[model samples]
Target: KQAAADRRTVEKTWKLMDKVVRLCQNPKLQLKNSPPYILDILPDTYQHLRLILSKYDDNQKLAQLSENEYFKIYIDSLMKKSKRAIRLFKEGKERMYEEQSQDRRNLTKLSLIFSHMLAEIKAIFPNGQFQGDNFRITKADAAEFWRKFFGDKTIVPWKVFRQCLHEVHQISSGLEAMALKSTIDLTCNDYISVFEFDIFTRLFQPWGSILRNWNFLAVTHPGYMAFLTYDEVKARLQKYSTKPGSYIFRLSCTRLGQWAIGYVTGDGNILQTIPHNKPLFQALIDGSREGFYLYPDGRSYNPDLTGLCEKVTQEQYELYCEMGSTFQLCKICAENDKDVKIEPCGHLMCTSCLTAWQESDGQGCPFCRCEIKGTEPIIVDPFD
Candidate 1:
């Protein structure tokens, strides 16, 4: 046990030593790219880290050396670089967008890469189980991996690697939402009449401020992993609470800026196609399911309840979110064109279309002929 613990600590120390050397000399390597995909790896940092990790592999080996004797020079250099980078990042994020700054993002990438690799080494090395702080390389690994492949795991522990992918995906999605929303706001020229300018500004200002803060923290803070698996992360971000009385029906994307009834889920109730519009319905449904690209109309295609759904300012996303059970006009059939009640389906198309289609030819369904099990009598509860 004692020997194993010592090995873990020693290995951890090596990773830190690498961090010190690479972090300090990163600028000299000159790997700064502009916004979008900013990443700076003092060229040697990459080489050094790769070499260190590979040394323990069965095929690769390094000369044995004591921690202090081997890393003293690199450690001193790293300390200075860490401090300088923090100061520079603080100033940079202010003048430019956080994502726009290459240097700060690279710092995060490096931090994560080191932390993740070290954590795995600690877990696997004979004495790693007992080592605490000394075994924390996962964080650095996460930062670097997330920046490059958005959380690729080609060279880390399986669990940690999967998690890297998940975190990267979620974070990227969030950032995309923010970018899209900002673009909309920009098109509006920052303000519009009839809308409460002061209130809109106040509400969005806080949100934008939060994003800015997150960028800075991500840019400067030590990399800390969520520890959740990739699938789990995706699941958490995907779900919609159903409201009673309103059948939750997904909107199928229409060629024009319209929606069709797609799939239905939640509670014990079910959905069915009416008549005549199966082709249209299928086209729209296929285009609106999860991950579907929003049609040219500019609406977001698929949105889960957690972040993607909540993050959308794209009115269409909101409409779909509201499609759950409580919405009326969900079940309006033929012969009730005028005063109709539409709940879950949210489709109040003329009832005449439903009856006419059924009478003419029964292909499968009107809206979406998925398979009509039973038909609910056309109950028209008219209202002004």
Candidate 2:
């Protein structure tokens, strides 16, 4: 039992030594909210850490050295010799350990925590919101973890990996959804820590601040053209015949995370495709034979389609976040179209009610029932 504890501690020392070295050199830690002077590893301090890492870097050698009686004595001797290294170690020790533990949750613990969310997400798009601290939990870590837990097993089943994949809200449908699921499953890329899962959904989205980027809006709408796998795109287009002008903008499985335009030409021959640099919007703006593109259920491209992704002010985007679409009708009157936005808070009122508010109430967008900020009452429309 004592030997086991010592082995774990010595194993930890290998990871900790490198972590301490990396943390000391991290520009992010140096630049962020914390003061650098106390936290910073000075020149001599860094050299001592580097020297220690250089000697103790290999895990195989480390494991062998762990059996030696001198290992503990060597660690203490070094710490006693360099008070600066000791200071740096103590400073980074808790922070390093905290990060290590955060990344080390076992699959069962993760499963229990994600229990309710798994069902809710399976029914809906895995509706997770991201933040400053959210991170990837990769298969590499999972294998390492399970080796410890199951004592020789390093594999996770596809079902568990699927649950982890769906636990984040990347929202999709049709072939985009199918290709995403299929590709991840095929490559065992269903694991949360893999690039395919990250590609399958945007984990970085902060939810309320959704982008008006073309790829997103196109993907966000189930009716739009976001069936984003190369093979699936070929299959979806082949049998479901559309007009020769029909084009689909999907994520490039060819380039991965980039956009590609696949379309039909004359004779129902579906050979068409770039702007390796430009985004989908720019590609559309620069493309040819673009009077209208078609999708099944009689979808067509026009000014309205452009409006799905056109630049709306931050206020309109917020309303889209709140109301789910910019063109949506009122919260107050079911009949009137939302025309003017009330200020301070960004609720939309129809032009009729807003026109009356010209002499306006200080109370909320009539529904908010609170005073407006004194900045410019209602931040009224001068016309966009």
Candidate 3:
């Protein structure tokens, strides 16, 4: 009986998720108070939202609710989530080293502790509100809020409260990706800390944050931005000892200023289709052989192809990481190799040299002689 009930519970949660996903797909169904997609990463987050969605389904009355009323529901959800997170932390810590439970316990403990620090993510306005606005509260104000609502300051610090504010109030679906990408840009690209990258990945419930979206992270990770050359990519692809059928090219597609991931097959001109409206998606759907490009061996029709897929094993990932950090020497300088970017004309050189050439000649690219538009060029690193 308990097993059957558990199964039913799981089914109901998915049904709620389905409803939430559909709400996200339709832009017209706006709930000013509630987020479109209910995040289910926290232990009981899904269950809490399941009850709310059950009520929503019965009434179907988001439009009729006032802003205050909507926020009341939203804040209530956050309060519940914060309390549950604290409880999970305590429980997990108690069983920290217990056999068969160490991993989950550590994850929960880390989640609770790290989330407190991550509460101040500047770029991600969960549900699009900040501490000074709709869900306004001063940093110190959070202590009082925690004391009144959560029973202590440590249990719900200002930052954690701020982070939870978004968790409970933001629109779901694409918003997570948006928040994650922005966080990564600020944390990884601008700040450039692999440590921060790892911490942020596990924080905010790994299942909920960018960690869940591996394809997005893999495609956009700052390390992929380092310079590499097409010849090097082709050489690596050809030389890597793998079965001919093994997938070689991991492709990142950008269209309408958004990104998606897909793969090209190993066979000559073999194309696979992906669902979505992005240009790459359309191209894949069309499966046109005209510009169909193979990885490493054949030339590419699309320039957005990032690098080779991340190796699955730890050893392989270590090797890939080493290769990524290995800077290829500039053909011009023949000395320093870092910060090399590719020109549209297929020339590889250091950024300083490229800038110098453009400034001195005002003619065109050093190699191709095409007009330099001062646009940021992509660094195409060798595929591993």
Candidate 4:
């Protein structure tokens, strides 16, 4: 709900700014004609800027303020506001982290309490008994146990006791109850399953991230996606709904371990031929898509790639057919299958040539201007 409200506010502000730009460019409206009432035209936050600009008008000189000066004033205000927005975002993120930590801590405490009680019950009755066959105890008995365990001398209220019992029942029957009851070292940050990997790879392919190709899979897994909204995943899925298995060329760096979208290509061996860094592709060699280490953690294994193969684009296949034997050679080096690599932008080059281009121009794909900062290199096999 809050996010929706924020989106509306941003949209409205954008429209107002758009109007300001158009109005400022209007030929007829100037200091000589009818200058806009700045206070009335701008948001309340920027009304102060108008007040400051009014100072320059000792004799209505404010109306004569140049567009360059006006633009600078607005830009300064926007920068200040943007910084404040970042600060607020950080604060909110911290608060959310702390709250989630507290919740996990509380759950751990509750699990410990339940385990202790279960142990005591076991000791009292040697015969293993189901939950329904447990012995009944008086409220005083339970209260005494709590006081002893927690070291709190205050008398327990009936309401509190009742709530505790309710929570106990909830945990016992809940999806996570069994694991929580058994494992002391259990954690929330585990590697995602194959199903999740499929969804995640498809979901993030269309969007660019600062993390880029370097540590691509490691960085953009469930751990990072947990912080983002599901709207993006839904939108991307919708964007590709009509085209099933529509694969494209993806590039990666071997050293950096980053990944990025390349050119559109058909499925099967064609998709696999696109270069990708060793660590990611090597993991797939075992034929087990499932791997132990598959996260941002230093120890997680890279899972095998899937859902990346698709139908080739007609232009690309036609170009390949025309090139014939030449297609097997690096476009730049003209060497037959020697250190071949493909950029995410669908440009083919030898590793040597690609490295030179990357070092010379750290902007993006040399051919298409696609950003490749800190991107990992993937080896493209011409023979494949």
Best by lDDT: 2
Which residues of candidate 1, in runs, are more than 4 Å off?
Answer: 1-63, 67-107, 124-384
Worst-scoring 10-residue span by lDDT in model 4: 184-193
For candidate 1, the 10 contiguous residues with the lowest summed lDDT are 186-195
lDDT of 1 by residue, 1-384 (tens): 012212344445446555555434545435333211113323334444345445444322322312322122223333333444455455555432344455445454334333322332233232312122232222333234333642222122222322333443343332233332221121111111111111122212223233332232112212111222223222332332132111112211111111222222344222322223222223333444532322212222222212311323334323322211111222232111233323434334444555665698765455555444444334332111
* Minimal lDDT window, size 10, model 3: 186-195
Compute each candidate's TM-score over C-alphas.
Answer: 0.19, 0.29, 0.21, 0.15
Local distance difference test values of all predictions, in order: 0.31, 0.37, 0.33, 0.30
lDDT of 3 at 212: 27
Reference-based lDDT, residue 363, model 1? 56
Q: In candidate 3, how many Å is residue 167 off? A: 29
Per-residue C-alpha lDDT of model 3 across residues 1-384, encoded as one tens digit per residue: 012212234344345434433432333323122111122223234444344334334222332221222223333333433443344435555443443464333333233322322232221124323221223222333223334544421122222332443453342322232333333322111121222332333322223322323433343332122212233334444442332321122322111112322223445223323234222323322333433333223323223323221213333233333322122334343333435444455556678777777678657876577865554544533220
Task: Please identify which of the two predictions, 2 or 4, would achieve the higher lDDT against the true structure.
Answer: 2
Off by over 4 Å in 2: 1-210, 214-216, 219-227, 240-242, 252-254, 288-298, 301-384
**lDDT tens string, model 4, 1-384?**
012212233344445444443433434323121112222323432333344344444534423332222123223334333333233334444332343443223322222222222233232222322121222322333333344433332222222332343342332221122121112111111111111122223323321221122123332332122111123323333333333332222222111113332211222111123234233333333223332223221113433344322122334323323312123334433322335434445555456766877788656765567764344444542113
lDDT of 2 at 148: 41
- Residue-wise lDDT of candidate 2 within 1-384, one digit each (tens)? 014214455344345434544544555333222211223322323344344345545776556544433234323322322333334445444553343332212211121212211222222211222111233323343333333433332123333543433343342322233323333322211222223333333321222222234234443432234324555566666764556655666543234434556666656766546445333444454453354344421246333334433323334323323211112344343233466665667666666665566466444556666554522323221111
